[PDB]
Amino acid sequence: XXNXXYX
């Protein structure tokens, strides 16, 4: 992945 969140 690589991005983060949280959705």
Next chain:
Amino acid sequence: XXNXXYX
């Protein structure tokens, strides 16, 4: 805080 990231 409470949200995430990463910026």
